[PDB]
C-alpha cells in the first residue's frame with residue numbers, strides 16, 4: 001500500500017518540528033505516540049492493563065495515567081519497555097493501518113519511537129532519523145526540564161546508543177543550525193520521497 005516514511009529522533013533533536021514541516025508540505029503525518037495516548041484513555045483495555053501491571057503508582061488522582069512516571073519506568077527498565085510496546089502494538093498497528101487507507105498525500109510520515117521494533121513496522125519504505133548536537137540537546141532539555149546542565153548531561157548519558165539506529169536509517173537529518181536550515185533539509189527530503197514514491201512499485 002501507501003509509501004510510508006518512519007520518523008524517529010533522539011531526545012530533543014527537533015523531530016516534532018520536522019513533522020510540522022512535512023505536514024506543512026501537505027504530507028499526512030501519523031503520530032504513533034498520540035494514538036498511544038488515545039488508546040490508553042480512561043477505561044480502555046490497555047489503560048486497565050497498564051494500571052493492573054504497574055499498579056496504583058501510575059494512576060494520578062484524577063484517574064489519568066501518570067505518563068511521565070510511566071516514561072521514567074520504561075526508559076530505565078527495558079523489560080517493561082518491551083512489555084508495554086508489546087501490549088499496545090496490536091492496537092496501535094490497527095489505528096495506523098486505518099489512517100494509511102485514507103491517506104491523501106503522495107507518501108505518509110509515521111512518527112515512531114527511537115528504538116522501534118521493525119517487525120511491528122515492516123511496511124516502511126524509509127526511516128528518517130533526526131538528531132541534534134549534545135549542546136543543542138542540553139540547551140533544549142534545560143529549557144524544557146529546567147535542570148542543571150549537569151542534570152541534562154545526566155539525562156543524555158542515559159540516552160540509548162544510536163550507532164545501530166544510525167546505520168539503519170536511510171537518511172539522517174542533522175539538526176545543527178537554525179529552523180531555517182531545518183526547513184530546507186526537510187524540503188530536500190520531501191523532494192526525495194516524492195521522487196522515489198513516483199518511481200517505485
Ligand SMILES: Nc1ncnc2c1ncn2[C@@H]1O[C@H](COP(=O)(O)OP(=O)(O)OP(=O)(O)O)[C@@H](O)[C@H]1O
Pocket residue numbers: 009010011012013014015016017018140175176177178179182
Ligand atoms: N534547529 C533549531 N534552531 C532553533 N530552534 C529549534 C531548532 N530545532 C527546533 N527548535 C525549537 O526547539 C523547540 C523544541 O521542539 P522539538 O521539535 O525539539 O521537539 P522534539 O525534539 O521532537 O521533542 P522530544 O524531546 O519529545 O523529541 C521548538 O520551539 C523548536 O522550534
